Amino acid sequence: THPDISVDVLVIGAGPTGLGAAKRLNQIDGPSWMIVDSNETPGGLASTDVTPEGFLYDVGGHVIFSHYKYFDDCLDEALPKEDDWYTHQRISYVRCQGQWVPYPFQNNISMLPKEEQVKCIDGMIDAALEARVANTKPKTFDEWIVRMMGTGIADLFMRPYNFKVWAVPTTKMQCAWLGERVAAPNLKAVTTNVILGKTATFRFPARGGTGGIWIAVANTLPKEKTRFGEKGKVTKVNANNKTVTLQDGTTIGYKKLVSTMAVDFLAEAMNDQELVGLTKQLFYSSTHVIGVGVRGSRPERIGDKCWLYFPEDNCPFYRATIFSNYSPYNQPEASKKLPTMQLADGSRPQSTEAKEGPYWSIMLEVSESSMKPVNQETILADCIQGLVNTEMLKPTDEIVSTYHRRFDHGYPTPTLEREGALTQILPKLQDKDIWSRGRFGSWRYEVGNQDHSFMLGVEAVDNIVNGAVELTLNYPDFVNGRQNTERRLVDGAQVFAKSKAQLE
Amino acid sequence: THPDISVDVLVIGAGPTGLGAAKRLNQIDGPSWMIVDSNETPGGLASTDVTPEGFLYDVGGHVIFSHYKYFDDCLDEALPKEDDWYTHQRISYVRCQGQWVPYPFQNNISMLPKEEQVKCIDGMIDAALEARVANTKPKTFDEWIVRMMGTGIADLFMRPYNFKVWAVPTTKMQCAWLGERVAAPNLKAVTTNVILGKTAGNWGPNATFRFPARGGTGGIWIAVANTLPKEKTRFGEKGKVTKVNANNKTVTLQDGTTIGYKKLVSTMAVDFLAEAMNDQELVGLTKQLFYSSTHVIGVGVRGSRPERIGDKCWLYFPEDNCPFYRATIFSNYSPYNQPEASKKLPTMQLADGSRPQSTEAKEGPYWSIMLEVSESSMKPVNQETILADCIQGLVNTEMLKPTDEIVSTYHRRFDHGYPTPTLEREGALTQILPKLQDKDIWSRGRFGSWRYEVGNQDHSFMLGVEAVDNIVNGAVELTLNYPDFVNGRQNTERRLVDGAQVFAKSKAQLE
Amino acid sequence: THPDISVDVLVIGAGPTGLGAAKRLNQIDGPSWMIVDSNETPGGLASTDVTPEGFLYDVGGHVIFSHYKYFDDCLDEALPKEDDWYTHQRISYVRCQGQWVPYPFQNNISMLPKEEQVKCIDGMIDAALEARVANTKPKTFDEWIVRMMGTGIADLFMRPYNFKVWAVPTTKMQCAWLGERVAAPNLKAVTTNVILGKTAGNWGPNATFRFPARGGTGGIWIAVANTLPKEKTRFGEKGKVTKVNANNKTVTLQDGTTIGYKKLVSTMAVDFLAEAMNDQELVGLTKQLFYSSTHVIGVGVRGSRPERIGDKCWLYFPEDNCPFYRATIFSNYSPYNQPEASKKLPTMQLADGSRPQSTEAKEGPYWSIMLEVSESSMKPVNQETILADCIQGLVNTEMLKPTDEIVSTYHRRFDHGYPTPTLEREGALTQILPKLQDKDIWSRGRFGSWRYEVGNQDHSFMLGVEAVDNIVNGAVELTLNYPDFVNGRQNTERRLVDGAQVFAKSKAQL
Amino acid sequence: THPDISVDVLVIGAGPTGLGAAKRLNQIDGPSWMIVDSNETPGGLASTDVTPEGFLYDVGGHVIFSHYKYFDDCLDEALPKEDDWYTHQRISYVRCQGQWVPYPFQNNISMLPKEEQVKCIDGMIDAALEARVANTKPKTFDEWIVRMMGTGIADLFMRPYNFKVWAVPTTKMQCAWLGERVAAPNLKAVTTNVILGKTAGNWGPNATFRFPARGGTGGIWIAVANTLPKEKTRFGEKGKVTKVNANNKTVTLQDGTTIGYKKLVSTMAVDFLAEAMNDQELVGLTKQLFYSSTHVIGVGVRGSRPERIGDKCWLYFPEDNCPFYRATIFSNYSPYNQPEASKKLPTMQLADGSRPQSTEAKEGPYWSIMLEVSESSMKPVNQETILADCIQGLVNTEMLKPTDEIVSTYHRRFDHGYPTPTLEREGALTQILPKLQDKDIWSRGRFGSWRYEVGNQDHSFMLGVEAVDNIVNGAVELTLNYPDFVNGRQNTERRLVDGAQVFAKSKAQL
């Protein structure tokens, strides 16, 4: 009994991780392979949605720093024109007590009341003294924060903010994921800034938002090796006889499997009780992505802002961005005409006539868990009110468009129990020739950015084919702390082979 | 052959130390005793001079702050009237970059330029981190400074200032002496003040303090001397000691008088004692000691008390725009330190150095300033020019406008001014003092025992008292050997009227 | 209404503290004074008792190290002959796991089993490392113990021993009383002795102490008292004080006699003084103080001095195979502490607790053992069985063979035995003493001021001397308030003959 | 103008490193390649020599612990029979004051004089206390040692031994090359062993290493080379490289042959390369490197194996009663390292250095010893007398009785023996390697990249493998730049058969 299709390497999922595996498989051009996804549009959670009124919203952020030349090579290939990209300056602010405090927070306590500055400085002094004598390392995220910042800064920012982000207490999280850097505060730089009173770029696609990158990357692949859409939905994986079954009944035989779906779904699709049980020990939070389109020129108070962080309790979201700042093509042009749905204060607008722009746009994120639930019916309104309370929207601003989507698997949580589970789950799948990789494929946030995830797929294939170490998967500190320039979209294998076929 | 006079206990010198010995001897009224001094006016280096134009000057605007009730008892006995004393609150600043920084220098960085504050705070951060782990103690004054303040504050103040005071580099002095002299900065306190822009200025035991209404500090010692039986004192040329024969326990006076003693308390500089003894070994050891001379400069000036001056007491001068290290507004201590307003005086010169528009005697009121300048083999001074240089320094510091009228000048150089706490000091004293002790000589006092940590007038007085108490009652000489012990407590046990005098008095009535 | 007697200074109590006050007063010979004691024989709890069979036992130890020349002058004066004293070598042992471990204990773990040595060294390594980084000081005796010794050595000796001594857990006691010495171990010396297997060679002649030839320690205090003008002493029932009226400064004796004073030096237990004053506030504060009772047991036995026992001095007992915390072969201190050989005595019992085979009086020679047992609310003792338990304890520790013949026993219980350095002590004393001071009452002594660190005979003596020096000459009471200061120096200034007496005498001849 | 030969990848040198490159290139079977060596026999400085009398001696030691599955695969493929290998227990001893001190030295101070134990333990106590508080990293090999062991152990072993090894004082060497773990001594374990006097634990299966039955170590590389296609190798005089033109990527051989390359893997000493390149700048930088020469000495002797020396071990010699720093009983590794019993040989001399009694050829059995002596401008050696001195050293260390019959001797001096981890090494290499890289030259190996940390046979093999992987597949050269990473993990990902070959083979069957 033979499957409808047979390939050496099967890739499940066409998010960044799956596309990475596909790109390196395509480059190597050795073993046979194919990639499937239930979504007709590749990009997974790094896709970009659009509102009926033409406002774009990324559902999974954007890369700010690439750690790898290989990732760069693929983006350059996908979007090879200078005008394909806008290049912006890396910046950030924290919203604290009516102030926009620049990153890094501790280096700008100067902008807080003098009383708060005292509590913060006393906190770092204590922490700096203890660190001088420390002979152990922190065991929880919380301990890490305190040793690093002092109780002062920890209570102002780190603690409350991180709870808003992870939907889980900082006491319930590990810290290893943060890196090897010794937990020791830079007291001198902090006080120096307090006394003096004083206080890097990234590219973003011009059109299509982040999702446009992955569409263009996928378009470089040989179309007949892709199966995207309902015809590409996987319904079961038979690990014992290495066969996958799709929704439409198609069967696929594989020798090695690279699975980028959530590892808990994989265990279900495998009907593996042991893996399902191990898999349930993992924790994750859901996230709500909220989009707000509004009429008007970009407000003075807002400027060239990007990520904004919100520790305080006058708004449910933990971060927001002025998405309209990243690219003029993220929202409709001025000439386009749209009706006002409501004002920022939640009341009916004066006129309901479709009017001109220009427009700007805000995007934000709310976290959710069994330890921090959210009312889905009221969350949109609360967020908008939150934009008011934080002085991002005037109560008079006119809202032209709203976007609200909830993602069940939003963040894989770095809980104290994560590694105990992963060190069992991953090797067990490995023994079955299954490479489970990705944000939820391998569940490691420290390597959960688009560039990391992409490379997790690239390296899994490199392990399958060339016996390479999976460095990003098992040594995040090693890859994050170096320049990764060795692996290129064009390696010696292809140069030599191409040159050979030329004089032959 | 007998000497002209014989006493159980002879006291040489009638400064604070000798007078302290005399007072306890007089209170005990047991063994016979007498006290001699080459000066006709008692008070030693705690005396007061006056210019022909009527301006009083101490040897450093002395200030009474006592660690002993017994010292208090004697001052109260000598000057028993409420109006004998003015009581003040210390108003002090350090002169740094056109600013008056309040006394605990470190708590007032908030008054320095921001750039400087940074260097200071960085310095303390380092020091605080090394202190958390230190397992040794400082060996020099300099290491002590750095470990306490950080290189920042050390360079801005401590180092330059202390060289101006001691006429010796901080790296050449020990550090077992500064317990109650130099403040101990706390990181939190300091940074909290720099944040709040608020101040603090109560450190040290100098903060109320009483000063004598009349005659200056010297007036205290004259009044104390007057409590003694005059016939047991020998003050003047007739009291000048020329020779000390330790072997047959006899002293020789200038007029040839000979005095036999059983026990000698000597308050003259220990290096002079060696000479007077004709003892080569001691003269030698004596050489290994070090001291700095000091110039006391007085300046009287016409005018109302400038509000730019205010109620300043002693001001500190680390910077190089003036020769003096410390200065005081003496006219602030008492209305009797300078002539009253009605008195008429001619202007001698203007602060800038030029002649006065008129050489006619004019009224007051008046105010007064006293300066000190240190001198040594490592930091010489030009005696002919030093007076002018100081006046010029008063200008550069904005104490005197170039326009101010100088009515009175005073200048006097004291050879023995400060007993220098060098690194070699204790190595010398731990030989000199025991050797004198074996001859039944109690050498005590500012230059008698040469320890600055107990060199104030109250310490010195008590060195004399305690020497007598050891001689007579077998008391421990606590102030001499344990400065930290006496400075760290209230010494209230020893009184001008002890149980011994009460019991003997009440027995005399019943009999 | 005038009292039957009036003096400038009244001293209550003729223990070492009282006698100290009397001696300085007698030397000064200025203000008038007298000294009373309810006991006919001076010496207080530093006296020496005797059994009907002629065995001596010190009730309150003996001085091993004198910190003062003044104390020396007075003992020299009291017992001026060379043959008035024996001079012995200073040494000590701890009884641990069948071993006599020499002082100090930590430097001799070599004698213990290797397993136990491991735990000890491990504990001190930890302590050493923590001390390298410590920035706080110990708050309890227990913490002080651990930081100094480590848990290993602490559990073997310090902890169990100290609980047996103070009859109070170490966690309940302060540690300032131990001095200002940094709580930290000398790892190198301890590991050096474990490796070398040897201890520091005998420093002989080494630190020696002197002990009186006759009459025991109590003999010192009888002779000291005899240098006093007898008419100024009132010892006996005729000297028992029943009431102290602080307000009009009057003291009332048993026989009804009334004494008026200007200054009072009271060396009786400060809680008894509170009582005798009828001051409720004081009595109240006085309750906050804690003390343990002690049992002094004496055993006289027949035979030459056995090989196993050795040469005198204190022995310490951490373990639970005996109720006592320390003991000493008293008969080693002087041949006059017990009957000579020719004396004939009947065996009372054997060490095992059984009747002897013969009850006929027989020759000696003899030897003798003295030991102490503490008692308190947290560590009670059965007064009927304690003697037997102690004797059995002597067998268990291998001090007596079960066959050894017991000729004499001695058992006496002292209500006030040790003033306990509890965490609460200073909070109470810093109120009690100043308050008594404001009434011209100098409460001084082992129980007069309640401070064990200055509770030895020389210290207590000097508390008396210094109180008088404060009353008369305004001297600082150094021993009372700065024990670390006096223990850390050579106190040579104050002498039995001071300059005052020299000058005065020299003048009387002229 | 075209060269006689053109390949994609040219490999110079057929030692472990060169053969490593060749193995991976051969496995990949993609780009064309060839490998050249001036030696007719492959093995480089890991080859085996034989004396005329039939005694074998490794010139470059043997692997004790392999860090890579890939290295294991290749050794397995080359020597696939069970009886191709012997497997021994990995142990080690240090010769200190007449004793054989087992590894590790510190855990065995027990068998030294008690006085030495004292200095050692005292040293570690200091080190341990400073380590509690340290906030900086060691800057020299010497400081690292002091912080690790303390001055006591440093003086007894570390300092003297390492000078004998590196021919350079420890103060002149870096320490990063040693690893990343903090310099903190395990004091408890050290003192626990001294106390217990033992060196034991609950234990499990003992650690082992394998050694080739025949041909010695050099037999591995001969067999590894044999698995390569012979026509892609050029070994012997015909393979000697004399010139390297980096600008037009051409190499010239002794016999005038020219070889064009696209990428070069050079395993010859990097100084020689700079010379062969005629590149002034690289010659200059190259001068800043430092190395020591080494003498390898072999001694065949008659007799059964003496009980005094029985194990297949290294022996280390800190003391100055012998010029060599390490030695081993090679005859213990394999019966085939020396002539069999029946073989008859004449005696050349006795251990004492005197003529034999009879010059007749006599049977065995035989055993063998080999040892090493360093040499440099800071520690010269007399080449004429070195053999005798070493033999005499063997006597002084009680390895040879003065009566032992020496049947065979061996002496050979390698100019490039150890690449020295000097303080200036990295400053030089961080310029040299990258500059060669920019010319498409991968200089790799013991003296190719000059890093002792990764200079073992397995490390070197892998330097070759990873260089090929970087050239072809863009792999990270982990062994080259991250020794700590590769040494602290099990490297199992890279196999002699990877997916690429499985997929390719399986495809060719459809």
Ligand SMILES: [Cl-]
């Ligand atoms: Cl930040």
Ligand SMILES: [Cl-]
């Ligand atoms: Cl060396």
